[PDB]
Amino acid sequence: AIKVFVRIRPPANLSLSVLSSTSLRLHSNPEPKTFTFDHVADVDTTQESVFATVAKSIVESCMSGYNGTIFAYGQTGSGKTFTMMGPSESFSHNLRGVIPRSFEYLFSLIDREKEKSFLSKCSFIEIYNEQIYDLLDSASAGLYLREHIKKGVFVVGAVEQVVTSAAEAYQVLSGGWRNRRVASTSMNRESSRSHAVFTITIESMEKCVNIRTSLLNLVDLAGSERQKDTHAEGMRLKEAGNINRSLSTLGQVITALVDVGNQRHVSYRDSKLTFLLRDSLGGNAKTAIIANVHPGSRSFGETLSTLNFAQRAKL
Amino acid sequence: NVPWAEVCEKFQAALALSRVELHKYKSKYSARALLEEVKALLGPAEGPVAQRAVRLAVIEFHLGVNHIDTEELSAGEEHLVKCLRLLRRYCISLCIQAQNNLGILWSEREEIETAQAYLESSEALYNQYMKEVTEQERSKRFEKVYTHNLYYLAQVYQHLEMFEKAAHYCHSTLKRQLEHEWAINAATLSQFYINKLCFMEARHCLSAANVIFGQTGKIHQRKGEIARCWIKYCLTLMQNAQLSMQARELFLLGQHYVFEAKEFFQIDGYVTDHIEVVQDHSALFKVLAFFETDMERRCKMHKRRIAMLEPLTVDLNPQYYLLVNRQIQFEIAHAYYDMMDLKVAIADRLRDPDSHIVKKINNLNKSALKYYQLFLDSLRDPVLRPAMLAKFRVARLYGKIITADPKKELENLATSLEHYKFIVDYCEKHPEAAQEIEVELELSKEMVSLLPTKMER
Numbered sequence: 001a002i003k004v005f006v007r008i009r010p011p012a013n014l015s016l017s018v019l020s021s022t023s024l025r026l027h028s029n030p031e032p033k034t035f036t037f038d039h040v041a042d043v044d045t046t047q048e049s050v051f052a053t054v055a056k057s058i059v060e061s062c063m064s065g066y067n068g069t070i071f072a073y074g075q076t077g078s079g080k081t082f083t084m085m086g087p088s089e090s091f092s093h094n095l096r097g098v099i100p101r102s103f104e105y106l107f108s109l110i111d112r113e114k115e116k117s118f119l120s121k122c123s124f125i126e127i128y129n130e131q132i133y134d135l136l137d138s139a140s141a142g143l144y145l146r147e148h149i150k151k152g153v154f155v156v157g158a159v160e161q162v163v164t165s166a167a168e169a170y171q172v173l174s175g176g177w178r179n180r181r182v183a184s185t186s187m188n189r190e191s192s193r194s195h196a197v198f199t200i201t202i203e204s205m206e207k208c209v210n211i212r213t214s215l216l217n218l219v220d221l222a223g224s225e226r227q228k229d230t231h232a233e234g235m236r237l238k239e240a241g242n243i244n245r246s247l248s249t250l251g252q253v254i255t256a257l258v259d260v261g262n263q264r265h266v267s268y269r270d271s272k273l274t275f276l277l278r279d280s281l282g283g284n285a286k287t288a289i290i291a292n293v294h295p296g297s298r299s300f301g302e303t304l305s306t307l308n309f310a311q312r313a314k315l
Numbered sequence: 316n317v318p319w320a321e322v323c324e325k326f327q328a329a330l331a332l333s334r335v336e337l338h339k340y341k342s343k344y345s346a347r348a349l350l351e352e353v354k355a356l357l358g359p360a361e362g363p364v365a366q367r368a369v370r371l372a373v374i375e376f377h378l379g380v381n382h383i384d385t386e387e388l389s390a391g392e393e394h395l396v397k398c399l400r401l402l403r404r405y406c407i408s409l410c411i412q413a414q415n416n417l418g419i420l421w422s423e424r425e426e427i428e429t430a431q432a433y434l435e436s437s438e439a440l441y442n443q444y445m446k447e448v449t450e451q452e453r454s455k456r457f458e459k460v461y462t463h464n465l466y467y468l469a470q471v472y473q474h475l476e477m478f479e480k481a482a483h484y485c486h487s488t489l490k491r492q493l494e495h496e497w498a499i500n501a502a503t504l505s506q507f508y509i510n511k512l513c514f515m516e517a518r519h520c521l522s523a524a525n526v527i528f529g530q531t532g533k534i535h536q537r538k539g540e541i542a543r544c545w546i547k548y549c550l551t552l553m554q555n556a557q558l559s560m561q562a563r564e565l566f567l568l569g570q571h572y573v574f575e576a577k578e579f580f581q582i583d584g585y586v587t588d589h590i591e592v593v594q595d596h597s598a599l600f601k602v603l604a605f606f607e608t609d610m611e612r613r614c615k616m617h618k619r620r621i622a623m624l625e626p627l628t629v630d631l632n633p634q635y636y637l638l639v640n641r642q643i644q645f646e647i648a649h650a651y652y653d654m655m656d657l658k659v660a661i662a663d664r665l666r667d668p669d670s671h672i673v674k675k676i677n678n679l680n681k682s683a684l685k686y687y688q689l690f691l692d693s694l695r696d697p698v699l700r701p702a703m704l705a706k707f708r709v710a711r712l713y714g715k716i717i718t719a720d721p722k723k724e725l726e727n728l729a730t731s732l733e734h735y736k737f738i739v740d741y742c743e744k745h746p747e748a749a750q751e752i753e754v755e756l757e758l759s760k761e762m763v764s765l766l767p768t769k770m771e772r
């Protein structure tokens with residue numbers, strides 16, 4: 001079943017009251033409405049508490065070989081960048097993110113588990129203007145996704161690196177995040193616009209053979225802006241004074257979504273982002289969901305749409 | 316009041332910045348600031364001059380695009396409904412621009428009842444415009460806003476269910492676009508026709524897509540699009556086989572189309588397109604049961620199809636491959652089922668106990684039970700109704716096909732009996748055919764408890 005684990009960034013007109021960690025009460029303007037979830041993290045919970053309980057439990061269960069689907073996600077100002085990347089590089093334990101904590105915990109599991117062998121696969125990708133970019137090489141740009149016959153879906157142009165320890169992982173992750181700082185100076189104007197995906201895939205040999213795989217995603221999708229995120233039970237309305245060629249292409253593909261029938265073959269020509277995610281949602285693994293969120297005062301209607309998206313994840 | 320040169324330079328500055336701020340940290344904030352600076356510049360604080368009326372209409376349109384830049388259209392909604400109220404009090408194009416902004420504002424209201432009511436009044440205004448009371452004789456911009464509000468009424472049609480209405484009107488939009496990348500729109504129209512049962516305008520839009528790709532117009536994603544055109548060609552043939560089952564020239568055009576399909580399929584990769592290949596090839600090689608000898612030839616041909624599928628898909632193996640190959644071995648199991656029926660037919664009508672014949676048919680039988688054992692490994696012995704159909708099929712395979720020494724039949728019927736017991740205490744739900752295998756298991760338990768005590772000694 002789906003285990004929704006959910007982190008809330010401290011908002012400090014929140015209009016939210018929290019009775020327990022499972023359930024939130026959301027006062028709304030027409031009428032207040034209560035929303036229950038499996039696990040909702042609050043202001044008072046720490047980074048280490050979420051890491052320990054949520055991340056340590058799920059990473060342990062991931063070590064068995066199921067791809068528990070850990071991902072950061074959110075709108076603009078969601079709190080993703082502080083908790084995973086950290087605000088700046090200025091070794092500071094609480095200010096550095098949960099990602100090197102996951103590195104040191106995974107390599108602690110690796111060396112205490114280590115009786116080809118346990119193999120690390122890490123990759124950073126960022127998607128701007130529907131184009132794949134790798135931060136390792138500036139030339140690496142517009143590389144194309146392919147799902148291989150390995151069952152390993154990957155970017156054709158990308159080259160992974162093996163990592164022996166969490167310190168080298170911190171060096172590579174700080175180099176990639178420093179390339180994100182340099183990239184913030186570059187054509188990547190906003191983290192809202194890009195789709196930055198850091199994935200960790202961990203391989204294991206049984207004993208020498210059979211391969212066990214876990215996936216740890218750090219996704220930085222569209223933010224709070226209102227142009228994208230292909231399907232919505234709110235605004236399924238493409239809104240724009242543009243050329244009806246392209247508007248009508250999207251109108252065609254949503255008309256194909258009308259032309260399903262009354263056995264959904266999940267769409268792969270929709271977006272490459274959601275294909276690189278369709279390996280996860282509806283994958284054959286445990287449905288463990290670490291998700292970051294943030295409720296927002298300002299876009300209260302769109303954060304109601306995200307809470308309804310959390311119920312859509314629940315169903 | 317603002318004179319002509321001043322309102323023209325205000326128009327030029329407003330449209331210039333509002334259309335240069337979209338090509339490409341806070342440029343759109345300053346763009347909104349300069350548009351509200353123009354809103355301060357208008358001075359908000361026949362009969363008279365109607366140029367002031369068309370000016371207030373077009374600057375209320377600019378107020379609407381300012382508010383959709385803010386996405387805080389509420390005061391803009393009130394000012395725009397006041398403007399369209401005073402325009403409804405009174406015409407060539409002010410009504411149609413007010414109708415575009417009216418549909419936009421009630422679309423951004425995001426409530427389906429009032430938006431659909433205002434959009435039916437929009438349809439009233441559209442046919443009142445189409446009663447027939449510059450760029451090219453006051454027709455070109457009218458044509459592009461005709462595309463605009465026709466696509467937005469298609470949007471409000473798909474917001475409701477309205478399948479035939481949105482399909483007919485999207486046909487109208489693509490035909491109005493074809494008055495002066497469209498093969499996928501014809502593909503979705505024909506896909507709607509696949510979801511329906513009429514198939515003449517389906518063929519007409521196949522020919523339309525073919526002639527607009529032959530006349531695309533040139534001073535790409537087309538490979539997968541024409542691949543899906545092959546897919547809907549063989550789906551039209553599948554619908555013909557459906558209406559003929561539940562002539563020769565249809566099979567000939569299907570064979571030519573699937574060969575050209577095969578070519579343009581293996582040209583463009585790929586991963587999932589080969590799943591579509593084995594899907595529609597197994598469909599057209601399964602439903603075309605019309606002869607005897609050529610029936611055996613096309614059975615050997617689809618065995619060749621799965622045989623060229625096999626030896627690189629065994630190396631493939633995702634868990635996704637376990638799912639899709641569970642469906643593929645389900646199809647191959649049905650193929651072995653009616654090939655078992657063909658085997659008992661050719662055993663009735665020809666001398667079966669020749670050595671190579673019985674060797675070949677027990678080879679196919681052991682391959683069928685091997686793939687059934689692979690379906691057993693699909694369940695982790697160390698959504699479920701096809702598994703009940705497969706339980707029926709493995710029970711019939713455990714019952715009938717054994718021509719060896721009669722010692723495995725009793726344990727095979729015992730395994731199917733305990734599987735039937737496992738289903739009737741695991742689901743407590745009605746099957747579709749397993750009452751026949753229930754009484755068949757009763758009679759076979761009786762006869763293999765009786766007869767081997769008389770024939771095995």
Ligand SMILES: Nc1ncnc2c1ncn2[C@@H]1O[C@H](COP(=O)(O)OP(=O)(O)O)[C@@H](O)[C@H]1O
Binds near residue numbers: 009076
């Ligand atoms: N849990 C938290 N506690 C305190 N401040 C936070 C927390 N999460 C985020 N912030 C702050 O909020 C701001 C926006 O967070 P950020 O992670 O950049 O959101 P996003 O990644 O969605 O843009 C940052 O300045 C960050 O320091």
Ligand SMILES: [Mg+2]
Binds near residue numbers: 080081192220
């Ligand atoms: Mg961020």
